[PDB]
């Protein structure tokens, strides 16, 4: 019975193989057939290539040794840069997405996965390209065994016993995929299930046949999520009693993600890996009042002016002159005001669902809010302690009731609460796992709902502050993402935004409810990456 | 008696003034005198400029309003891009270093300092330049009062009462510096000491006369240091029982600072702000065994192979494909081995004091170490518990005894310890304050010296591992910084490094002891920044 799956890198998880370049160069340059493949293989287990693969020498030391082997092979046959050929071959090699997806599905079903590869110590000036590829790939496997790190190469029998010992599995429990028949043989001899990989489709057909798990023709997978315990956690004190916590991933321009109510940095779990992979340094906040960030009890600690000043202090303390600010729900309203009051500090601004809403100077914000009845539920949030009591009463019930797709609603507010005619034990939304709900439950045990609710308790102060910006326009790069099925933050509420943000760009997600990030993560990622790459560097 | 100092930005803390561009443009373009200065000032307290300065409109909205004022002024006089003129004026404006140094000296002597400025909300595509300038400047002051944020401008009397209220000082306690006589007048009326700033030298002469503090002709100041409570603190779990803590500052290429024995991330306190200001994202580690990082008790948890693997995991979890690695003492030996075993992950490598030392395959590492007697003191570190007992006995004594310049030594090892004929209450080195020593004392109360000493307890394992690299060369960008007066890690010990690192660059610091970073911080900063900018992007 199979319990582990092992994959080769070149020609299996990454294509085109760095090998099918020696053959192409030969054909493109009309050289005698196999000449470059000969020079690459010269000396066998004693030659330059075996030394490179075992980590005895680096790639840069190997380049002149391969060049010398090439002249010797040309001399024998009786008949230009090796560096250039390999540089081009390495940069053209991309992850084989269907093969990676099959490895991901096997691990999700309980398989132990590993990459076993004959590789080198890359010290070329262009080494970052390969470092990036290996870093993206390795995260998805339990083990990465590199020949140059273990000082053993395939087909040597000891690398296979080393593999078995690493997996803590007997050979019959292992399926082993390789594109080189010679490197597959010792695995076969030990009793492992082997797959000679030529075309991906046939290899996966063989793989699904042996595992009894569907790998081909599967539904589109969700983007990579985050495991909290595996993230880098950052903490910045913005003032004596207030610290802000964030999760941080990637390199490049800073992108600051600002969640809504009643959420977490974790609401961005499907965005963080995708944006980091796209070339950005992601800073996913726990907003003031939430998770590991401070939660002072005072209502005025949560007015927009205070919240924005603290996010500016956050950038100051991290040594960031700017960040792109992306917000959802309350976080989306905060980001529009960051763009209006601190344009110097905002590289670009994007909001999911929340439109930019200016103050009406001729109407009280209480009059104005009552003219938009979808917000009647926010009146229930006004009286201190009332909504805290209901929402803190059963956290699992609170999160399972709230985090539901547009057609899964279980929730007027003069019924006497948000959960009056709601189930005491709601079903789990198709958007979340029980484990994800328990993460939110755990986060909210620290400070509960007082700080989060206080974000709604500053209408008058926020209106006075917003009035200072009535003569301004938002002229920095901006994106408004509407969600078809958000019944509170409806797409039509954003219709006047071009009057204030003339250069505004848009995105729109059909069949998407309020919880945009987890409702339509692939779509959110596609929209944000496209906009960041075109408007935020 | 003076207790606070207030500085203007344009023409005082930053030069050349964005004003002395209107006059220059007029002369360069042979326009009627004062025409552009007229159009800029049009409408007085009712005009476009006052609206901009109060934050009613942004800079991008003001540009076409100023253009219109220019055509009206040209029409009156009977006689090209405003955007281009202001873009050039803003980017040419640099911090007035002697003025900043005087503000720094006053604060160090107990003065409350503030910047009071008539400024704008900058939403130009080039706004980052100014954001960078303001971010560097503001960190050095207690308060930054911006006209566009408070909705008041100088010379309006209310901005001065607001200033006094912010400082919590009576007018007679405040000295106020401005380059505009009109903006100085209301401060004078209230009873504040005022300084009309034309040339910096005369202004500081007036400033030293009123404060009784020497500001002009002072010794060269030390670089900016770090206040631990003001830094962003990061934590990454690299394996179940091990987490690594780091301090993080700045944006740009990742630079990972690796301290020595028995040190802290704080040993880089003079480097962190300078490198971040230079355009780098600094990650200053607490190395395994230290400060807030985990300190497992097992000797083998501190072998070079394990330490390097964990630093690779650290990069993986942060989503960094590479970092520049800069090390000192044990950290310097770790960085050379990172370059040798993980070149793909090392953008560039630099070591302070520690030379790259290969394994001698024909000699036991114990034989080899005894052939270099300066290391005899490391034999004392071998027996578990012996050096822990002496070093943990009195932490203040330990750090004050160790952290001394080359001519301040108070420390053979068969005397029966490092502090045998050493003072029980050593004097404070000219390199450190009592507060800095107490920071180290506090850090070492958590785990003490077991983990740190374990770095020396893996000679045999490290030799076996290092032997795998004997056929390699370090061919990625590398810098070796020697310290004239380090009597253990002597400059001559690095003489063979070019044999292993042919493209090696060097730096050398005269009259510098073992504690390079705090001994010669300005010199260290100059050397590292120059090398990073030329070899690490
Ligand atoms: C959430 C919210 C929504 C709409 C408005 C409209 C006008 N004024 C407000 O304060 C307001 C607040
Ligand atoms: C429509 C509606 C009703 C209740 C709630 C309660 C808590 N949070 C929400 O976002 C919400 C939205
Ligand atoms: C600036 C702004 C815009 C909308 C709202 C809505 C409800 N409450 C607010 O405080 C608020 C503040
Ligand atoms: C705040 C808010 C806004 C919209 C929705 C829509 C559907 N379900 C919700 O819980 C919800 C909550
Ligand atoms: C600190 C140190 C210094 C020199 C050497 C020389 C040869 N071998 C070693 O292990 C060694 C270790
Ligand atoms: C020469 C010498 C002697 C003792 C010590 C003790 C602790 N740490 C050192 O670095 C050191 C260096
Ligand atoms: C690789 C290397 C080089 C020098 C030394 C010196 C002392 N101890 C070591 O373990 C060591 C390890
Ligand atoms: C490890 C080490 C190396 C050199 C020195 C030089 C002077 N003083 C020291 O304490 C010291 C410690």
Swiss-Prot record, chains A, B:
<dbReference type="GO" id="GO:0042577">
    <property type="term" value="F:lipid phosphatase activity"/>
</dbReference>
<dbReference type="InterPro" id="IPR023198">
    <property type="entry name" value="PGP-like_dom2"/>
</dbReference>
<keyword id="KW-0449">Lipoprotein</keyword>
<keyword id="KW-0963">Cytoplasm</keyword>
<dbReference type="GO" id="GO:0005782">
    <property type="term" value="C:peroxisomal matrix"/>
</dbReference>
<keyword id="KW-0216">Detoxification</keyword>
<feature type="active site" description="Proton acceptor">
    <location>
        <position position="514"/>
    </location>
</feature>
<dbReference type="InterPro" id="IPR023214">
    <property type="entry name" value="HAD_sf"/>
</dbReference>
<feature type="binding site">
    <location>
        <position position="377"/>
    </location>
    <ligand>
        <name>substrate</name>
    </ligand>
</feature>
<dbReference type="GO" id="GO:0042803">
    <property type="term" value="F:protein homodimerization activity"/>
</dbReference>
<dbReference type="InterPro" id="IPR000073">
    <property type="entry name" value="AB_hydrolase_1"/>
</dbReference>
<dbReference type="GO" id="GO:0016311">
    <property type="term" value="P:dephosphorylation"/>
</dbReference>
<keyword id="KW-0378">Hydrolase</keyword>
<dbReference type="GO" id="GO:0042632">
    <property type="term" value="P:cholesterol homeostasis"/>
</dbReference>
<feature type="binding site">
    <location>
        <position position="8"/>
    </location>
    <ligand>
        <name>Mg(2+)</name>
    </ligand>
</feature>
<keyword id="KW-0597">Phosphoprotein</keyword>
<feature type="region of interest" description="Epoxide hydrolase">
    <location>
        <begin position="229"/>
        <end position="537"/>
    </location>
</feature>
<dbReference type="GO" id="GO:0009636">
    <property type="term" value="P:response to toxic substance"/>
</dbReference>
<feature type="modified residue" description="N6-acetyllysine">
    <location>
        <position position="209"/>
    </location>
</feature>
<dbReference type="Pfam" id="PF00561">
    <property type="entry name" value="Abhydrolase_1"/>
</dbReference>
<dbReference type="GO" id="GO:0005829">
    <property type="term" value="C:cytosol"/>
</dbReference>
<feature type="modified residue" description="N6-succinyllysine">
    <location>
        <position position="445"/>
    </location>
</feature>
<dbReference type="GO" id="GO:0016791">
    <property type="term" value="F:phosphatase activity"/>
</dbReference>
<keyword id="KW-0576">Peroxisome</keyword>
<dbReference type="InterPro" id="IPR036412">
    <property type="entry name" value="HAD-like_sf"/>
</dbReference>
<feature type="region of interest" description="Phosphatase">
    <location>
        <begin position="1"/>
        <end position="218"/>
    </location>
</feature>
<dbReference type="GO" id="GO:0046272">
    <property type="term" value="P:stilbene catabolic process"/>
</dbReference>
<comment type="function">
    <text>Bifunctional enzyme. The N-terminal domain has lipid phosphatase activity, with the highest activity towards threo-9,10-phosphonooxy-hydroxy-octadecanoic acid, followed by erythro-9,10-phosphonooxy-hydroxy-octadecanoic acid, 12-phosphonooxy-octadec-9Z-enoic acid and 12-phosphonooxy-octadec-9E-enoic acid. Has phosphatase activity toward lyso-glycerophospholipids with also some lower activity toward lysolipids of sphingolipid and isoprenoid phosphates.</text>
</comment>
<dbReference type="GO" id="GO:0000287">
    <property type="term" value="F:magnesium ion binding"/>
</dbReference>
<dbReference type="Pfam" id="PF00702">
    <property type="entry name" value="Hydrolase"/>
</dbReference>
<dbReference type="GO" id="GO:0090181">
    <property type="term" value="P:regulation of cholesterol metabolic process"/>
</dbReference>
<keyword id="KW-0511">Multifunctional enzyme</keyword>
<feature type="binding site">
    <location>
        <begin position="117"/>
        <end position="118"/>
    </location>
    <ligand>
        <name>phosphate</name>
    </ligand>
</feature>
<keyword id="KW-0443">Lipid metabolism</keyword>
<dbReference type="InterPro" id="IPR029058">
    <property type="entry name" value="AB_hydrolase_fold"/>
</dbReference>
<feature type="modified residue" description="N6-acetyllysine">
    <location>
        <position position="42"/>
    </location>
</feature>
<keyword id="KW-0460">Magnesium</keyword>
<dbReference type="InterPro" id="IPR011945">
    <property type="entry name" value="HAD-SF_ppase_IA/epoxid_hydro_N"/>
</dbReference>
<dbReference type="GO" id="GO:0004301">
    <property type="term" value="F:epoxide hydrolase activity"/>
</dbReference>
<dbReference type="GO" id="GO:0033885">
    <property type="term" value="F:10-hydroxy-9-(phosphonooxy)octadecanoate phosphatase activity"/>
</dbReference>
<feature type="active site" description="Proton donor">
    <location>
        <position position="456"/>
    </location>
</feature>
<keyword id="KW-0058">Aromatic hydrocarbons catabolism</keyword>
């Amino acid at each position: 019975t199979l319990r582990a799956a092992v994959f080769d890198l070149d020609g299996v998880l990454a294509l085109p193989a760095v090998f099918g370049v020696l053959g192409r160069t030969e054909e493109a340059l009309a050289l005698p057939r196999g000449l470059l493949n000969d020079a690459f293989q010269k000396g066998g287990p004693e030659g330059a290539t075996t030394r490179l693969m075992k980590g005895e020498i680096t790639l840069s030391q190997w380049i002149p040794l391969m060049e010398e082997n090439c002249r010797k092979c040309s001399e024998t046959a009786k008949v230009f840069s090796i560096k250039e050929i390999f540089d081009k071959a390495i940069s053209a090699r991309k992850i084989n997405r269907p093969m990676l997806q099959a490895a991901l599905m096997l691990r999700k079903k309980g398989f132990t996965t590993a990459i076993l590869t004959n590789t080198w110590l890359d010290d070329r000036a262009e080494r970052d390209g390969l470092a990036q590829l290996m870093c993206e790939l390795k995260m998805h496997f339990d083990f990465l065994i590199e020949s140059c790190q273990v000082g053993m190469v395939k087909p040597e029998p000891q690398i296979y016993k080393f593999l078995l010992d690493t997996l803590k599995a007997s050979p019959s429990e292992v399926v082993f995929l390789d594109d080189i028949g010679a490197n597959l043989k010792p695995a076969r001899d030990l009793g492992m299930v082997t797959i000679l990989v030529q075309d991906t489709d046939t290899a996966l057909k063989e793989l699904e046949k042996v595992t009894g798990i569907q790998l081909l023709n599967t539904p589109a997978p969700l983007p990579t999520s985050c495991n909290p315990s595996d993230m880098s956690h950052g903490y910045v004190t913005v003032k004596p009693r207030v610290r802000l916590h964030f999760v941080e991933l990637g390199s490049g321009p800073a992108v600051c993600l600002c969640h809504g109510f009643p959420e977490s940095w974790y609401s961005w779990r499907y965005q963080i890996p995708a944006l980091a992979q796209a070339g950005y340094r992601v800073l996913a906040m726990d907003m003031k009042g939430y998770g590991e960030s401070s939660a002072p009890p005072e209502i005025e600690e949560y007015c927009m002016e205070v919240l924005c000043k603290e996010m500016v202090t956050f950038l100051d303390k991290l040594g960031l002159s700017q960040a792109v600010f992306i917000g959802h729900d309350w976080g989306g309203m905060l980001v529009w005001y960051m763009a209006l009051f601190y344009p110097e500090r905002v590289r670009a601004v994007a909001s999911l669902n929340t439109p930019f809403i200016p103050a009406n100077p001729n109407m009280s914000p209480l009059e104005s809010i009552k003219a938009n009845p979808v917000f009647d539920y926010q009146l229930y949030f006004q009286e201190p302690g009332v909504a805290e009591a209901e929402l803190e009463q059963n956290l699992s019930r609170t999160f399972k009731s709230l985090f539901r797709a547009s057609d899964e609603s279980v929730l007027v507010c003069e019924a006497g609460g948000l959960f009056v005619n709601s189930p005491e034990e709601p079903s789990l939304s198709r958007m979340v796992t029980e484990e994800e709900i328990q993460f939110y439950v755990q986060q909210f045990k620290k400070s509960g709902f007082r700080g989060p609710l206080n974000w709604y308790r500053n209408m008058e102060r926020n209106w006075k502050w917003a009035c200072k910006s009535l003569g301004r326009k938002i002229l920095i790069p901006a994106l408004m993402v509407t969600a078809e099925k958000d019944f509170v933050l409806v797409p039509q509420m954003s219709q006047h935004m071009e009057d204030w943000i003339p250069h505004l760009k848009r995105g729109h997600i059909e069949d998407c409810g309020h919880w945009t990030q987890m409702d339509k993560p692939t779509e959110v990622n596609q929209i944000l990456i496209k906009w960041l790459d075109s408007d935020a560097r």
